[PDB]
Amino acid sequence: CSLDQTVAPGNLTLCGNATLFTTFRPKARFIAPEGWMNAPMGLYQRADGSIHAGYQSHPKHIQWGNISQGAAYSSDFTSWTDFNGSEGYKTIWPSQIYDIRGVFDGSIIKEGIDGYPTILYTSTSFGPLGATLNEAEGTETQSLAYTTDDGASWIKLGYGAGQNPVIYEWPETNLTGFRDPYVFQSPRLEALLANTTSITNATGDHFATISGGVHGDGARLFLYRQHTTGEFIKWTYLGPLVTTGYKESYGEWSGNYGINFETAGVTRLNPAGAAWDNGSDTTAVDFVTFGTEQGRADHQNHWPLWAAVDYEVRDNGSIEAVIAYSGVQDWGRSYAYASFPVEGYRQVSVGWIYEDDDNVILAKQFGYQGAFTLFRDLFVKVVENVSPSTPGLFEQASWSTKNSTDGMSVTVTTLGQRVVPETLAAYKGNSTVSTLAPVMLNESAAAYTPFSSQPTDRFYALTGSFEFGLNTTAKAGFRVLASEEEYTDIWFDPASENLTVVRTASSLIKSFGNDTELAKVKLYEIVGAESKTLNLTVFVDGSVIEIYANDEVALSTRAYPWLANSTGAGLLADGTTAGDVVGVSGLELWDGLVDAWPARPANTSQGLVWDGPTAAMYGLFAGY
Amino acid sequence: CSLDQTVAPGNLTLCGNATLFTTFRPKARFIAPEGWMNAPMGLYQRADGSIHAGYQSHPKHIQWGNISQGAAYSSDFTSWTDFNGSEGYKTIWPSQIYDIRGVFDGSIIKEGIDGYPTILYTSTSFGPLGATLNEAEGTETQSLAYTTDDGASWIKLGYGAGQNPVIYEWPETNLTGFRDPYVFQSPRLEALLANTTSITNATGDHFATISGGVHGDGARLFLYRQHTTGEFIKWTYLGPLVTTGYKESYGEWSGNYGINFETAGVTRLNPAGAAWDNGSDTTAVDFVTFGTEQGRADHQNHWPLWAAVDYEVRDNGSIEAVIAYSGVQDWGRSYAYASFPVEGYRQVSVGWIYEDDDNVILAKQFGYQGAFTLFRDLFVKVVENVSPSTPGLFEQASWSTKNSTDGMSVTVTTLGQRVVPETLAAYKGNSTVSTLAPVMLNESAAAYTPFSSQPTDRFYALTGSFEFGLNTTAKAGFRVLASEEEYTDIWFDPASENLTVVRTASSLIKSFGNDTELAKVKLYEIVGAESKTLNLTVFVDGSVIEIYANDEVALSTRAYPWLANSTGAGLLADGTTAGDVVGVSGLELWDGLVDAWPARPANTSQGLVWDGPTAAMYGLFAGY
Ligand SMILES: *[C@@H]1O[C@H](CO)[C@@H](O[C@@H]2O[C@H](CO)[C@@H](O[C@@H]3O[C@H](CO[C@H]4O[C@H](CO[C@H]5O[C@H](CO)[C@@H](O)[C@H](O)[C@@H]5O[C@H]5O[C@H](CO)[C@@H](O)[C@H](O)[C@@H]5O)[C@@H](O)[C@H](O[C@H]5O[C@H](CO)[C@@H](O)[C@H](O)[C@@H]5O)[C@@H]4O)[C@@H](O)[C@H](O[C@H]4O[C@H](CO)[C@@H](O)[C@H](O)[C@@H]4O[C@H]4O[C@H](CO)[C@@H](O)[C@H](O)[C@@H]4O[C@H]4O[C@H](CO)[C@@H](O)[C@H](O)[C@@H]4O)[C@@H]3O)[C@H](O)[C@H]2NC(C)=O)[C@H](O)[C@H]1NC(C)=O
Ligand SMILES: *[C@@H]1O[C@H](CO)[C@@H](O[C@@H]2O[C@H](CO)[C@@H](O[C@@H]3O[C@H](CO[C@H]4O[C@H](CO[C@H]5O[C@H](CO)[C@@H](O)[C@H](O)[C@@H]5O[C@H]5O[C@H](CO)[C@@H](O)[C@H](O)[C@@H]5O)[C@@H](O)[C@H](O[C@H]5O[C@H](CO)[C@@H](O)[C@H](O)[C@@H]5O)[C@@H]4O)[C@@H](O)[C@H](O[C@H]4O[C@H](CO)[C@@H](O)[C@H](O)[C@@H]4O[C@H]4O[C@H](CO)[C@@H](O)[C@H](O)[C@@H]4O[C@H]4O[C@H](CO)[C@@H](O)[C@H](O)[C@@H]4O)[C@@H]3O)[C@H](O)[C@H]2NC(C)=O)[C@H](O)[C@H]1NC(C)=O
Ligand SMILES: *[C@@H]1O[C@H](CO)[C@@H](O[C@@H]2O[C@H](CO)[C@@H](O[C@@H]3O[C@H](CO[C@H]4O[C@H](CO)[C@@H](O)[C@H](O[C@H]5O[C@H](CO)[C@@H](O)[C@H](O)[C@@H]5O)[C@@H]4O)[C@@H](O)[C@H](O[C@H]4O[C@H](CO)[C@@H](O)[C@H](O)[C@@H]4O[C@@H]4O[C@H](CO)[C@@H](O)[C@H](O)[C@@H]4O)[C@@H]3O)[C@H](O)[C@H]2NC(C)=O)[C@H](O)[C@H]1NC(C)=O
Ligand SMILES: *[C@@H]1O[C@H](CO)[C@@H](O[C@@H]2O[C@H](CO)[C@@H](O[C@@H]3O[C@H](CO[C@H]4O[C@H](CO)[C@@H](O)[C@H](O[C@H]5O[C@H](CO)[C@@H](O)[C@H](O)[C@@H]5O)[C@@H]4O)[C@@H](O)[C@H](O[C@H]4O[C@H](CO)[C@@H](O)[C@H](O)[C@@H]4O[C@@H]4O[C@H](CO)[C@@H](O)[C@H](O)[C@@H]4O)[C@@H]3O)[C@H](O)[C@H]2NC(C)=O)[C@H](O)[C@H]1NC(C)=O
Ligand SMILES: *[C@@H]1O[C@H](CO)[C@@H](O)[C@H](O)[C@H]1NC(C)=O
Ligand SMILES: *[C@@H]1O[C@H](CO)[C@@H](O)[C@H](O)[C@H]1NC(C)=O
Ligand SMILES: *[C@@H]1O[C@H](CO)[C@@H](O)[C@H](O)[C@H]1NC(C)=O
Ligand SMILES: *[C@@H]1O[C@H](CO)[C@@H](O)[C@H](O)[C@H]1NC(C)=O
Ligand SMILES: *[C@@H]1O[C@H](CO)[C@@H](O)[C@H](O)[C@H]1NC(C)=O
Ligand SMILES: *[C@@H]1O[C@H](CO)[C@@H](O)[C@H](O)[C@H]1NC(C)=O
Ligand SMILES: *[C@@H]1O[C@H](CO)[C@@H](O)[C@H](O)[C@H]1NC(C)=O
Ligand SMILES: *[C@@H]1O[C@H](CO)[C@@H](O)[C@H](O)[C@H]1NC(C)=O
Ligand SMILES: *[C@@H]1O[C@H](CO)[C@@H](O)[C@H](O)[C@H]1NC(C)=O
Ligand SMILES: *[C@@H]1O[C@H](CO)[C@@H](O)[C@H](O)[C@H]1NC(C)=O
Ligand SMILES: *[C@@H]1O[C@H](CO)[C@@H](O)[C@H](O)[C@H]1NC(C)=O
Ligand SMILES: *[C@@H]1O[C@H](CO)[C@@H](O)[C@H](O)[C@H]1NC(C)=O
Ligand SMILES: *[C@@H]1O[C@H](CO)[C@@H](O)[C@H](O)[C@H]1NC(C)=O
Ligand SMILES: *[C@@H]1O[C@H](CO)[C@@H](O)[C@H](O)[C@H]1NC(C)=O
Ligand SMILES: *[C@@H]1O[C@H](CO)[C@@H](O)[C@H](O)[C@H]1NC(C)=O
Ligand SMILES: OC[C@H]1O[C@](O)(CO)[C@@H](O)[C@@H]1O
Ligand SMILES: OC[C@H]1O[C@](O)(CO)[C@@H](O)[C@@H]1O
Specify the residue with its C-alpha closest to ligand 5, atom 4: A6
H-helix or E-strand spanning residue B62: none
Instruction: Measure the CA–CA gap between A303 and A290, rounded to whole angstroms.
Output: 8
Please say whether the beta carbons of B252 and B171 come within 8 A: no
Which of B467, B433, B461 is CA-nearest to residue B584? B467
Cα B308 from chain centre? 17
Please say whether the beta carbons of B199 and B317 come within 8 A: yes
DSSP-based helix, strand, coil % in chain B, nearest 5: 5, 45, 50
Please say whether the beta carbons of A167 and A250 come within 8 A: no
Nearest ligand 15 atom to alpha carbon B172: 9
Give the helix ranges, DSSP H, for A158-273: 187-193, 197-200
Backbone torsion region of residue A517, taken as left when φ is above 0, otherwise alpha when ψ lies between -120 and 50, otherwise beta: beta
Whether B595 is in the pocket of ligand 17, judged by its Cβ within 6 Å, is: no
Specify the residue with its C-alpha closest to ligand 3, atom 4: B609
Nearest CA in chain A to B102: A97
- Residue B618 has its nearest CB partner, among A66, A125, A612, at A125
Residues of A in contact with B613 (CB under 8 A): 161, 168-169
Residue B200 phi, psi (nearest 5): -105, -20
CATH classification for the domain delimited by B1-428, as one of 2.30.110.10, 2.30.30.100, 2.115.10.20, 3.30.2080.10? 2.115.10.20
Task: State the resolution, in angstroms.
Answer: 1.9
Instruction: Measure the CA–CA gap between A99 and A93, rounded to whole angstroms.
Output: 8
Nearest CA in chain B to A167: B614
| Strand, helix or coil for residue A321 | strand
Per the DSSP assignment, residues forming a β-bridge with B452 are: none
Instruction: Measure the CA–CA gap between B478 and A308, rounded to whole angstroms.
Output: 85
Identify the CATH number of the domain defined by range B429-624.
2.60.120.560
E runs forming strands in B314-458: 319-328, 334-342, 346-353, 368-369, 371-372, 376-386, 400-403, 410-419, 432-435, 439-441, 448-450
Instruction: Measure the CA–CA gap between A496 and A498, rounded to whole angstroms.
Output: 5
- Residue B611 has its nearest CB partner, among A100, A137, A159, at A159
What is the 3 state secondary structure string of B88-101? ECEEECCCCCCCCC
Please say whether the beta carbons of A459 and A427 come within 8 A: no
Residue B409 Cα to ligand 16 middle (Å): 9
Residue B188 phi, psi (nearest 5): -55, -60
Please say whether the beta carbons of A589 and A583 come within 8 A: no
Instruction: Measure the CA–CA gap between A43 and A417, rounded to whole angstroms.
Output: 18
What is the 3 state secondary structure string of A388-400? CCCCCHHHCCCCE
Instruction: Measure the CA–CA gap between A404 and A385, rounded to whole angstroms.
Output: 9
Select from B193, B223, B311, B314 the residue to mutate for testing ligand 15; criterion: most ligand atoms less than 8 Å from CB.
Answer: B314
Residue A403 Cα to ligand 9 middle (Å): 6
Instruction: Specify the DSSP class assigned to residue B198.
Output: H
Which of A349, A353, A348, A351 is CA-nearest to residue A371? A353
Give the helix ranges, DSSP H, for A307-420: 363-366
Please say whether the beta carbons of B77 and B375 come within 8 A: yes
Q: Is A13 exposed, middle or buried (0-12, 13-18, 19+ CB in 10 A)?
A: exposed
Which of B66, B598, B188, B556 is CA-nearest to residue B349? B556
Helix (DSSP H) and strand (DSSP E) numbers for chain B: 5, 38
What is the 3 state secondary structure string of A186-201? CHHHHHHHCCCHHHHC
| Strand, helix or coil for residue A363 | helix
Q: Where do the structural domains in chain A lie, given as residue ranges?
A: 1-428, 429-624
- As a whole number of Å, the CA-based R_g of chain B is 24
Instruction: Measure the CA–CA gap between A349 and A361, rounded to whole angstroms.
Output: 31
| Strand, helix or coil for residue B596 | coil
Please say whether the beta carbons of A306 and A328 come within 8 A: yes
Measured in residues, chain A has a length of: 624
Please say whether the beta carbons of A559 and A568 come within 8 A: no
Any long-range contacts for A46-50 (C-beta under 8 Å, 24+ apart)?
Answer: A46/A73, A46/A117, A46/A150, A46/A151, A47/A150, A48/A150, A49/A75, A49/A343, A50/A74, A50/A75
Please say whether the beta carbons of A571 and A437 come within 8 A: no
Specify the residue with its C-alpha closest to ligand 4, atom 72: A610
Q: Vertex A597, ends A591 and A598: CA angle to 5°?
A: 85
Please say whether the beta carbons of B147 and B153 come within 8 A: yes
Nearest ligand, CA B254:
19
Any long-range contacts for B225-229 (C-beta under 8 Å, 24+ apart)?
Answer: B225/B193, B225/B200, B226/B202, B227/B201, B227/B202, B227/B203, B228/B203, B228/B204, B229/B203, B229/B204, B229/B205
Nearest CA in chain B to A161: B612
Residue B85: count other Cβ atoms within 10 Å of its Cβ.
13
Upper half-sphere CA count for residue B6 (Cβ side, 13 Å):
0
Instruction: Measure the CA–CA gap between A503 and A488, rounded to whole angstroms.
Output: 5
Which experimental technique did the depositors report for determining this structure? X-ray
Instruction: Measure the CA–CA gap between A223 and A200, rounded to whole angstroms.
Output: 13
Which of A456, A494, A496, A502 is CA-nearest to residue A478? A502
Cis, peptide link before residue A9, omega less than 30° from 0:
no
CB-based burial, B437-466: b 16+ in 10 Å, e otherwise = eebebbeebeebbebeeebeebbbbbbbeb
Q: Is A602 exposed, middle or buried (0-12, 13-18, 19+ CB in 10 A)?
A: exposed
Q: Vertex B413, ends B410 and B415: CA angle to 5°?
A: 160
Residue A137 Cα to ligand 8 middle (Å): 19
Residue A281: count other Cβ atoms within 10 Å of its Cβ.
13
Instruction: Measure the CA–CA gap between B410 and B392, rounded to whole angstroms.
Output: 13
Instruction: Measure the CA–CA gap between A66 and A101, rounded to whole angstroms.
Output: 6
Specify the residue with its C-alpha closest to ligand 2, atom 82: B114
| Residue B211 Cα, gap to closest chain A Cα (Å) | 20
Residue A578: count other Cβ atoms within 10 Å of its Cβ.
8
Please say whether the beta carbons of B460 and B540 come within 8 A: yes
Instruction: Measure the CA–CA gap between B448 and B476, rounded to whole angstroms.
Output: 10
| Strand, helix or coil for residue A572 | strand
Mention every residue, 6+ apart, whose C-beta is less than 8 A from residue B376: B348, B349, B350, B417, B418, B419, B420, B554
Nearest ligand, CA B5:
13
Instruction: Measure the CA–CA gap between A330 and A547, rounded to whole angstroms.
Output: 9
Residues in chain A whose beta carbon is closer than 8 A to a beta carbon of chain B? 66, 94-95, 97-98, 100-101, 125-126, 136-138, 141, 159-163, 165, 168-169, 609-614, 617-618, 620
Nearest ligand, CA B171:
15
Per the DSSP assignment, residues forming a β-bridge with B288 are: B266, B307
Instruction: Measure the CA–CA gap between B180 and B168, rounded to whole angstroms.
Output: 13
Residue B563: count other Cβ atoms within 10 Å of its Cβ.
19
Instruction: Measure the CA–CA gap between A50 and A73, rounded to whole angstroms.
Output: 7
Whether B96 is in the pocket of ligand 2, judged by its Cβ within 6 Å, is: yes
At A63, which amino acid appears?
Answer: Q
Which of B146, B147, B33, B22 is CA-nearest to residue B81? B33
Confirm or deny that A64 is annotated as ligand binding: yes
Mention every residue, 6+ apart, whose C-beta is less than 8 A from residue A194: none
Residue B7: count other Cβ atoms within 10 Å of its Cβ.
10
Select from A400, A403, A405, A525 the residue to mutate for testing ligand 9; criterion: most ligand atoms less than 8 Å from CB.
Answer: A403
Please say whether the beta carbons of B233 and B244 come within 8 A: no
Q: What is the DSSP string of A398-418?
A: SSEEEE-TTSS-EEEEEEEEE
Nearest CA in chain B to A623: B160
Instruction: Measure the CA–CA gap between A582 and A601, rounded to whole angstroms.
Output: 44
Select from B64, B67, B99, B105 the residue to mutate for testing ligand 21; criterion: most ligand atoms less than 8 Å from CB.
Answer: B105
Cα B40 from chain centre? 9
H-helix or E-strand spanning residue A149: none
Residue B445 Cα to ligand 18 middle (Å): 8
Whether A132 is in the pocket of ligand 7, judged by its Cβ within 6 Å, is: no
CB-based burial, B496-506: b 16+ in 10 Å, e otherwise = ebebbbbbebb
Please say whether the beta carbons of A277 and A284 come within 8 A: yes
Are A97 and B169 a contacting pair at CB < 8 A?
no
Instruction: Measure the CA–CA gap between A580 and A573, rounded to whole angstroms.
Output: 11
Q: Is A186 exposed, middle or buried (0-12, 13-18, 19+ CB in 10 A)?
A: buried
Residue B342 phi, psi (nearest 5): -135, 140
Residue A247 Cα to ligand 7 middle (Å): 21
User: Which residue ranges of B make up the annotated binding site?
Assistant: 38, 64, 105, 179-180, 262
Please say whether the beta carbons of B387 and B526 come within 8 A: yes
Is the Cα dihedral B356, B360, B363, B365 positive or negative? negative
Q: What is the DSSP string of B337-371?
A: EEEEEETTTEEEEEEEE--S-TT-SSHHHHTEE-E
Residue A382 phi, psi (nearest 5): -120, 125
Residues of B in contact with A142 (CB under 8 A): none
Instruction: Measure the CA–CA gap between A596 and A81, rounded to whole angstroms.
Output: 9
Nearest CA in chain B to A66: B97
Are A66 and B611 a contacting pair at CB < 8 A?
no
What is the 3 state secondary structure string of A425-476? HHHHHHCEEEECCCEEECCCCCCEEECCCCCCCCEEEEEEEEEEECCCCCEE
Residue B466 Cα to ligand 13 middle (Å): 30
Are A165 and B614 a contacting pair at CB < 8 A?
yes
Instruction: Measure the CA–CA gap between B374 and A554, rounded to whole angstroms.
Output: 74
Instruction: Measure the CA–CA gap between A531 and A516, rounded to whole angstroms.
Output: 28
| Residue B519 Cα, gap to closest chain A Cα (Å) | 42
Whether B606 is in the pocket of ligand 17, judged by its Cβ within 6 Å, is: no
Residue B380 Cα to ligand 19 middle (Å): 27
Residue A159 phi, psi (nearest 5): -80, 130
